[PDB]
């Protein structure tokens, strides 16, 4: 299915995923895409941090659903 | 100074702070409002996540800026 990845500066990806995919898993698709390295990557849904070994449908995350993505660099 | 602090679910507060506040300093002053633990919150401003030990001036964060609040909970 497809997803929506939005940053908060206004970039928008579409991804190619599945619903039991991983946090992890999608991260891995981010880089794979943009070349973002996953340990960067904080991906957001509900209003909250979402967890690398939960699935797209623990979170009820389904087809078109957009999540946000912010950046952590130290 | 003023800043507002909203969270990705249309929640929106204002806050008194300093430039030289440290992003931990204003994680305590949420944590004041709104009784959330400063280790269950992530600030964002400009697309990047925030770092703790770093202050509102070293990002250039100005009066009346807004801060997104993202939370940070196991299992949820």
Redesign the interface.
């Known amino acids: 299915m497809q997803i929506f990845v939005k940053?908060?500066?206004g970039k928008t990806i579409t991804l190619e995923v599945e619903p039991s995919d991983t946090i992890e898993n999608v991260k891995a698709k981010i880089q794979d895409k943009e070349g973002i390295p996953p340990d960067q990557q904080?991906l957001?849904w509900?209003?909250?941090?979402l967890?690398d070994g939960r699935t797209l449908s623990d979170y009820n995350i389904q087809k078109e659903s957009t999540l946000?993505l912010?950046?952590?660099?130290?």
């Open positions: 940053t908060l500066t904080r957001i509900a209003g909250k941090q967890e946000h912010v950046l952590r660099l130290r």
